[PDB]
Design an enzyme around this catalytic site. Structure first.
Site, PDB file in Angstrom:
ATOM      1  N   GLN A 192      -9.896   8.804  -4.584  1.00 37.92           N
ATOM      2  CA  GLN A 192      -9.830   8.293  -2.957  1.00 37.92           C
ATOM      3  C   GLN A 192     -10.857   8.485  -2.045  1.00 37.92           C
ATOM      4  OE1 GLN A 192      -7.294   6.101  -3.341  1.00 37.92           O
ATOM      5  NE2 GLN A 192      -6.375   6.738  -1.357  1.00 37.92           N
ATOM      6  N   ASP A 240      -6.568  -5.812   5.113  1.00 33.87           N
ATOM      7  CA  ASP A 240      -6.013  -5.409   4.002  1.00 33.87           C
ATOM      8  C   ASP A 240      -6.289  -4.068   3.341  1.00 33.87           C
ATOM      9  OD1 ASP A 240      -4.653  -6.431   1.318  1.00 33.87           O
ATOM     10  OD2 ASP A 240      -6.677  -5.733   0.345  1.00 33.87           O
ATOM     11  N   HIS A 274       2.083  -3.453  -3.447  1.00 32.72           N
ATOM     12  CA  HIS A 274       1.593  -5.033  -2.941  1.00 32.72           C
ATOM     13  C   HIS A 274       3.086  -5.647  -2.877  1.00 32.72           C
ATOM     14  CE1 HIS A 274      -2.390  -4.049  -4.779  1.00 32.72           C
ATOM     15  NE2 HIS A 274      -2.487  -4.591  -3.436  1.00 32.72           N
ATOM     16  N   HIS A 320      -0.803 -12.853   1.734  1.00 32.30           N
ATOM     17  CA  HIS A 320      -2.036 -13.104   0.729  1.00 32.30           C
ATOM     18  C   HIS A 320      -1.801 -12.323  -0.451  1.00 32.30           C
ATOM     19  CE1 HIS A 320      -2.361  -8.959   2.286  1.00 32.30           C
ATOM     20  NE2 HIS A 320      -3.296  -8.719   1.577  1.00 32.30           N
ATOM     21  N   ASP A 321      -0.537 -11.725  -0.398  1.00 33.90           N
ATOM     22  CA  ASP A 321      -0.198 -10.877  -1.701  1.00 33.90           C
ATOM     23  C   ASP A 321       1.063 -11.710  -2.632  1.00 33.90           C
ATOM     24  OD1 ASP A 321      -2.197  -8.923  -2.327  1.00 33.90           O
ATOM     25  OD2 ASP A 321      -1.265  -7.591  -0.537  1.00 33.90           O
ATOM     26  N   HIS A 348       3.262  -4.116   2.646  1.00 27.70           N
ATOM     27  CA  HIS A 348       1.978  -3.943   2.827  1.00 27.70           C
ATOM     28  C   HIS A 348       1.547  -5.237   3.410  1.00 27.70           C
ATOM     29  CE1 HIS A 348      -2.227  -3.461   2.166  1.00 27.70           C
ATOM     30  NE2 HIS A 348      -2.471  -5.022   1.503  1.00 27.70           N
TER      31      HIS A 348
HETATM   32  C1  LIG Z   1      -4.098   6.423  -4.553  1.00 28.84           C
HETATM   33  C2  LIG Z   1      -4.297   6.120  -6.063  1.00 28.84           C
HETATM   34  C3  LIG Z   1      -5.721   5.926  -6.488  1.00 28.84           C
HETATM   35  O1  LIG Z   1      -6.038   4.879  -5.689  1.00 28.84           O
HETATM   36  C4  LIG Z   1      -7.377   4.507  -6.239  1.00 28.84           C
HETATM   37  C5  LIG Z   1      -8.091   4.750  -7.414  1.00 28.84           C
HETATM   38  C6  LIG Z   1      -9.149   4.207  -7.644  1.00 28.84           C
HETATM   39  C7  LIG Z   1      -9.867   3.132  -6.853  1.00 28.84           C
HETATM   40  S1  LIG Z   1     -11.370   2.711  -7.212  1.00 28.84           S
HETATM   41  O2  LIG Z   1     -11.203   1.935  -8.362  1.00 28.84           O
HETATM   42  O3  LIG Z   1     -12.055   2.289  -6.158  1.00 28.84           O
HETATM   43  N1  LIG Z   1     -11.994   4.238  -7.824  1.00 28.84           N
HETATM   44  C8  LIG Z   1     -12.785   4.975  -7.027  1.00 28.84           C
HETATM   45  C9  LIG Z   1     -14.170   4.266  -6.630  1.00 28.84           C
HETATM   46  N2  LIG Z   1     -14.911   4.209  -8.241  1.00 28.84           N
HETATM   47  C10 LIG Z   1     -16.189   4.096  -8.061  1.00 28.84           C
HETATM   48  C11 LIG Z   1     -14.021   3.382  -9.050  1.00 28.84           C
HETATM   49  C12 LIG Z   1     -12.614   4.133  -9.336  1.00 28.84           C
HETATM   50  C13 LIG Z   1      -9.136   2.950  -5.650  1.00 28.84           C
HETATM   51  C14 LIG Z   1      -8.015   3.253  -5.424  1.00 28.84           C
HETATM   52  C15 LIG Z   1      -7.485   2.790  -4.306  1.00 28.84           C
HETATM   53  N3  LIG Z   1      -7.203   1.358  -4.152  1.00 28.84           N
HETATM   54  C16 LIG Z   1      -6.559   0.767  -3.120  1.00 28.84           C
HETATM   55  C17 LIG Z   1      -6.600  -0.643  -3.081  1.00 28.84           C
HETATM   56  C18 LIG Z   1      -5.378  -1.092  -3.779  1.00 28.84           C
HETATM   57  C19 LIG Z   1      -6.056   1.608  -2.149  1.00 28.84           C
HETATM   58 BR1  LIG Z   1      -5.285   0.677  -0.672  1.00 28.84          BR
HETATM   59  C20 LIG Z   1      -6.063   3.057  -2.114  1.00 28.84           C
HETATM   60  O4  LIG Z   1      -5.432   3.937  -1.301  1.00 28.84           O
HETATM   61  N4  LIG Z   1      -6.722   3.736  -3.389  1.00 28.84           N
END
Ligand SMILES: CCCOc1ccc(S(=O)(=O)N2CCN(C)CC2)cc1-c1nc(CC)c(Br)c(=O)[nH]1
Length: 297
Positions: free
Chosen positions: A254, A205, A76, A116-117, A80
């Site tokens: 992911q 975003d 962030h 925004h960030d 980004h």
């Molecule tokens: C890459 C390192 C891991 O990254 C994540 C890990 C977990 C989740 S989570 O909370 O949605 N997770 C799976 C769904 N679940 C049911 C709850 C638990 C999101 C990510 C993620 N967020 C963003 C937005 C910042 C970006 Br961009 C991104 O690429 N990855």
């Protein structure tokens, strides 16, 4: 000096800068090049001429925004924000969303995307810093707006920045998806317009998730780096998500992130404009790659 160099530079065309491409990457660009891309965004969206933006003022504002991003934040950060703005540009141009919106809405979206960030995942976003910069001496890119235009624009900026709270996206997306499914989606409806603008902000975003695999892989490393840093800070001040020892969980996370958050959004956006399909296509391709990794695990 950054300002003198920026202001004096020739701004290459949008075509040269590749900013119309959904598959755009910033990895090989210098900070100066990201500033020139940003000038090209404002210029080719007809915002500079239309709102009488002084070149030196636009340059200074971009530099102020850039420098107000913290450097010790792995994901962030300015890059980004800049990518969010580039995705907005691509959606407006290649995605053909520009004709659906007013000039003030476009002005607000681009500023919101870039800003925004600033006050930096269910994190809250804030617009206070954005506004302070916009009102700063020498940074007043909205000075050319009439009072009425100014009031309209600020309201949209605030809503657009707030929209990037994933909690608000989750709360409001069901209504969006259903309007679309029931062929009731109507941009002439002020409520729906506002809703659409929020969903577009989210789409931009989260757009790293749609990039070509080598690009998504690298951005995912940055995301993980930020998560783990926050885990370490929470200890001194940790779930597996923010625990550097549970890194083999990343592919599965992911896939979960795509399935739970991203895919329905790019599906909905494609229904609104077919020309945004490449975002959806890229997101589908990345899921397949992460899944394959989650199974080799
Ligand atoms: C890459 C390192 C891991 O990254 C994540 C890990 C977990 C989740 S989570 O909370 O949605 N997770 C799976 C769904 N679940 C049911 C709850 C638990 C999101 C990510 C993620 N967020 C963003 C937005 C910042 C970006 Br961009 C991104 O690429 N990855």
């Amino acid at each position: 000096r950054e300002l003198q160099s920026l202001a004096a530079a020739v701004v290459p065309s949008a075509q040269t800068l590749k900013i119309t491409d959904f598959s755009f990457s910033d990895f090989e660009l210098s900070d100066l090049e990201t500033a020139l891309c940003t000038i090209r965004m404002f210029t080719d969206l007809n915002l500079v001429q239309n709102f009488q933006m002084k070149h030196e003022v636009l340059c200074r504002w971009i530099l102020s925004v850039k420098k107000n991003y913290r450097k010790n934040v792995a994901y962030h950060n300015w890059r980004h924000a800049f990518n969010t703005a580039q995705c907005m540009f691509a959606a407006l141009k290649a995605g053909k969303i520009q004709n659906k919106l007013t000039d003030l809405e476009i002005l607000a979206l681009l500023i919101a995307a870039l800003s925004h960030d600033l006050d930096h995942i269910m994190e809250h976003h804030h617009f206070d810093q954005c506004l302070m910069i916009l009102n700063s001496p020498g940074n007043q890119i909205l000075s050319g707006l009439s009072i009425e235009e100014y009031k309209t624009t600020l309201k949209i900026i605030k809503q657009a920045i707030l929209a990037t709270d994933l909690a608000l996206y989750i709360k409001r997306r069901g209504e969006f998806f259903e309007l679309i499914r029931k062929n009731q989606f109507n941009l002439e409806d002020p409520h729906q317009k506002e809703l659409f603008l929020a969903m577009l902000m989210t789409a931009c975003d989260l757009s790293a998730i749609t990039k070509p695999w080598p690009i998504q892989q690298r951005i995912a490393e940055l995301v993980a780096t930020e998560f783990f840093d926050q885990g370490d800070r929470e200890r001194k001040e940790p779930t597996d998500l923010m625990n550097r020892e549970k890194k083999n969980k990343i592919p599965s996370m992911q896939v979960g992130f795509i399935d739970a958050i991203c895919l329905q959004l790019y599906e909905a956006l494609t229904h609104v404009s077919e020309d945004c399909f490449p975002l959806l296509d890229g997101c589908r391709k990345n899921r397949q790659k992460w899944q394959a990794l989650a199974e080799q695990q």
